[PDB]
Design an enzyme around this catalytic site. Sequence first.
Site, mmCIF file in Angstrom:
data_model
loop_
_atom_site.group_PDB
_atom_site.id
_atom_site.type_symbol
_atom_site.label_atom_id
_atom_site.label_comp_id
_atom_site.label_asym_id
_atom_site.label_seq_id
_atom_site.Cartn_x
_atom_site.Cartn_y
_atom_site.Cartn_z
ATOM 1 N N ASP A 35 0.826 -1.201 0.000
ATOM 2 C CA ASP A 35 0.000 0.000 0.000
ATOM 3 C C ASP A 35 0.864 1.257 0.000
ATOM 4 O O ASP A 35 1.366 1.674 1.043
ATOM 5 C CB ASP A 35 -0.933 -0.023 1.220
ATOM 6 C CG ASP A 35 -1.856 1.186 1.297
ATOM 7 O OD1 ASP A 35 -1.939 1.972 0.325
ATOM 8 O OD2 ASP A 35 -2.518 1.339 2.349
ATOM 9 N N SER A 199 -0.106 15.577 -12.169
ATOM 10 C CA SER A 199 -0.348 15.210 -13.558
ATOM 11 C C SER A 199 -0.522 16.458 -14.402
ATOM 12 O O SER A 199 -1.061 17.461 -13.936
ATOM 13 C CB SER A 199 -1.584 14.315 -13.674
ATOM 14 O OG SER A 199 -1.875 14.055 -15.041
#
Length: 330
Positions: A35, A199
Site C-alpha cells: 500500500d 499530472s
Amino acid sequence: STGSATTTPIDSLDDAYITPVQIGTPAQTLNLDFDTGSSDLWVFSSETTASEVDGQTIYTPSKSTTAKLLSGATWSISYGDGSSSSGDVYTDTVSVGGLTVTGQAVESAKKVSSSFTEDSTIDGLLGLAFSTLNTVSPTQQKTFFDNAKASLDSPVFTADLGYHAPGTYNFGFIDTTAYTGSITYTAVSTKQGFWEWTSTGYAVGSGTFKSTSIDGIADTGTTLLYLPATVVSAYWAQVSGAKSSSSVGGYVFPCSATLPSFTFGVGSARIVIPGDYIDFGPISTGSSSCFGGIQSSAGIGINIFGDVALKAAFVVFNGATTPTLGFASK
Ligand SMILES: CNC(=S)Nc1ccc(Br)cc1Cl
C-alpha cells in the site's frame, strides 16, 4: 541487495493485489496488501480478537525465535474507506522476494474493522508511503522500504500491476525489460507523507488532450481512479447511459456500453488506461448496471491515482534524497 515478488489480484475485478511476505523464524508467510498510500506493516495475528478472524492467515509471534516485543508500543489506524485496525508491536525479520530486513516493526492486530474480517484473502497491509505517516506510538517506526533502502543497489521500488493478471513489485532495481519506451520522472511532494505528484492533464478516448494540473497521490492500496468532478463528468459524458447514482455511490453504466480509454499526463508523456480497465462489473449480482472505475474525488479532499491508473504503467517509486516518481508505458 534486491528483491522481487509477484503480486496477484484477490479477485476477478482486481479489487486489490496480494504479495507473499515472509515474517519471522521459521518463516510465516502472509499475503499482504502492498500500500503506497500508507506506512504501517500490520498483520492478522494470534492476538486478533477471535470473532474478527475469518479465513485469514495469522502471524504468531510466540512461534518466531526472532520476534521481540516492542515494549510499550501501540498502533491505531483508520483508512480512507472507513476501515480501521489497532494493536501492539513486535520487531522481527521480514523478507519480500529474497530481500530481508531484520528488526522490522510488525504491527500485530488486536482489533480489525469488519471490512478486513470480511476479506479472507488479505492477511494484512505493508505500507510503502513515507514513514512520517506511521502510527506507532510513542516511537514512530520505519516502513519496510525505509529500512531496506541503504542496502538496496538503488534506493527505489517499482510497481508493475497486472490487468486481470499477476504483476511484480521490485526493490532495488529497475527491470528495463518490463516497460516500453522511456520512463518519465516527475516531482514528488512528501509534505502529506504520500507519493504526491502533479499530472499535466488528461484526454478522454480519442479526444484532444486537456492541459491542466491535477495534484494527486500514487496509491497502490486504492482500487479506483479518483479525480476532480469536472474531469470525471467529462469522462462519463462520453459513455452512453452513464449516470451518477447517489444510492450506489458513484457513476454507473450499462455494460452494453463501450468504455473509452482515459489518458493522463506525466510531464510531456502520456499514460493510456484502456477502457476495459475502467469496468468494475455489476453493482449487484445479476444487475445490468455496472460500476465505473473512474470516480469523483470531491468527498475525499485529495485525488487518488489508484490501481486503475497505476496498472496501466510501469511505476518507479524513487526514494533518492529528493524522491521522485517515474511512469512508463508497458
Ligand atoms: C475497500 N476499499 C477499496 S479502495 N477497495 C476494495 C474494494 C473491494 C475489495 Br473486495 C477490496 C478492496 Cl481493498
